[PDB]
Amino acid sequence: PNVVFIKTEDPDLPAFYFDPLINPISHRHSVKSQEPLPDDDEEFELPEFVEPFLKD
Amino acid sequence: KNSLAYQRMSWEALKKSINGLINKVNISNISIIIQELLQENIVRGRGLLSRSVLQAQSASPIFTHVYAALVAIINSKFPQIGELILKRLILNFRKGYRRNDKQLCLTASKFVAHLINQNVAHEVLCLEMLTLLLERPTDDSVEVAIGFLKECGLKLTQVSPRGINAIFERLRNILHESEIDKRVQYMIEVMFAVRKDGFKDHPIILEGLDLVEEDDQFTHMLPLEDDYNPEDVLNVFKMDPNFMENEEKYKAIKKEIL
Amino acid sequence: KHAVQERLAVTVCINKIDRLILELKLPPTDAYYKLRHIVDEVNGLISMY
Amino acid sequence: RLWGDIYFNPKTRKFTKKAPTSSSQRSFVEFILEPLYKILAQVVGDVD
């Protein structure tokens, strides 16, 4: 399957090099999405585990 | 009396001479233009010269690179004059931005880019203008920013790679982490394409225009936001009591740099 | 195209994100940009007829 | 719901269409994708 393996010589591992990008950033909508309404209040997210899996 | 009459007449001839020189300047003749300009009291007429250069570039941004080279040569001999041009140009850009005058934003920014290319102005100004334009990105604000980055981008890459990297990261967030239209999404893809080819169509200084020795230039550090005084009053004729002294003072300068 | 010609229920399960981020080493934002881009591309490619 | 919306830690869930903090990652790159990055990169980089 033709691995290309961009090498690294600098820190900050997501360097984003040898990589173009044709998606127009900061503005796109062409498909309908569920929940177009930020209306729901805090009801079910338990604050003991509202957090993601890791921050340590 | 005659003192007033002569000062006024000399003032009117000076304005015309400058105006002509600014209309004539191009790449092939810049050196003679400089020589002819230096014969004139461009200290007394520093406001006149600044105004002519600024109006010319605004009406003829096709020659921005040439006006930048001209300013660069003058600034190397008279830094205070280059500073006066820069102060007004910065204020012009801000006026345009404030008034949503896209054409003036396009031409004033283009001038800034080339004064940076010519080491007359510090690149901090470019970075700050790009940040401003890209904070609340509009079709027009992105169009100004991208045209601007094209012109000073190669220079930016050399003197401030991390700064230009921050700009590109910001553009990518706009390209993906924003709801943008086709026009914005195209102009940004163009900007990344230009960076990829190493700004091959946007060199820092065209052959024939790099005429000031590196160490002879004076690079002004002028941020975007400062409360600059444009000193437009310098454009208006006024009787000078020390006209005699001031005149003989200039010719002493002229004989120096020739 | 042959699926929408046969009007089968078009679903998709794309593969190899370990080839995407352990091999091309994208950041999270650009990876979300690429995945939303390919989802919008296959949406616009199915929405032809 | 966790697609195309931005999560931020105080005021627990208000899944806005904008970014309150100027560097705000979305809910898809804070709940599923970057934890997969953390487990994957720590198990292939820090094994001892």
List all residues 6 or more positions away from C8 whose beta carbon is below 8 Å from its beta carbon: none
Residues of A in contact with C40 (CB under 8 A): 28, 30-31
Tell me the C-alpha distance between D38 and D33, whole Å: 9
- Reading the block at residue A53, the tokens are 């899996």
List all residues 6 or more positions away from B79 whose beta carbon is below 8 Å from its beta carbon: B218, B220
CB D39 to CB A45 under 8 A?
no
Angle at B136 between CA B135 and CA B141, to 5 degrees: 95
Tell me the C-alpha distance between D43 and A54, whole Å: 14
Q: Is residue C25 annotated as involved in ligand binding?
A: no
Kind plus residue range of the DSSP H or E element containing B223: none
Tell me the C-alpha distance between D2 and D25, whole Å: 12
First to last CA, chain B: 33
Residues of B in contact with A29 (CB under 8 A): 179
- Reading the block at residue B169, the tokens are 């990261």
Tell me the C-alpha distance between B21 and B39, whole Å: 12
Find chains touching chain D: ≥3 CB pairs under 8 Å: A, C
Q: Is residue C30 annotated as involved in ligand binding?
A: no
Placement of tokens 């990105």 in the chain? B137
Distances (CA, A) of B220 to B115, B232, C5, D22, D48: 10, 20, 66, 31, 54
- Reading the block at residue A9, the tokens are 């010589």
Tell me the C-alpha distance between B44 and B243, whole Å: 9
In eight-state DSSP terms, residue C6 is T
Residues of D in contact with C36 (CB under 8 A): 4
CB B46 within 8 A of CB B80: yes
Sign of the torsion formed by the C-alpha atoms of B57, B60, B61 and B63: negative
CB B180 to CB A24 under 8 A?
yes
Strand partners of residue B220: B121
The alpha carbon of B152 is separated from its chain's Cα centroid by a whole number of angstroms, namely 12
CA nearest D15: which of B31, A41, C22, C31? A41
CB contact A50 to D (< 8 Å) = yes
Query: What backbone phi and psi angles, to 5 degrees, belong to B29?
Result: -120, 10
List all residues 6 or more positions away from B161 whose beta carbon is below 8 Å from its beta carbon: none
Q: Is residue C21 annotated as involved in ligand binding?
A: no
Strand partners of residue D6: D16, D26
Range C9-24 burial, b when 16+ CB lie within 10 A, else e:
eeeeeeeeeeeebeeb
Own/partner pairs for D4-9, CB < 8 Å, 24+ apart?
D4/A33, D4/C36, D4/D28, D5/A35, D5/A38, D7/D31
SS3 C39: helix
Identity at B123, one-letter amino acid code: E
CB B165 within 8 A of CB B157: no
Kind plus residue range of the DSSP H or E element containing A7: none
Residues of C in contact with B175 (CB under 8 A): 33
CB A25 within 8 A of CB B174: yes
Q: Is residue C18 annotated as involved in ligand binding?
A: yes
List all residues 6 or more positions away from C20 whose beta carbon is below 8 Å from its beta carbon: C26, C31, C34
CA nearest B114: which of B168, B78, B77, B155? B155
Placement of tokens 């600024």 in the chain? B54
Sign of the torsion formed by the C-alpha atoms of B232, B235, B238 and B244: positive
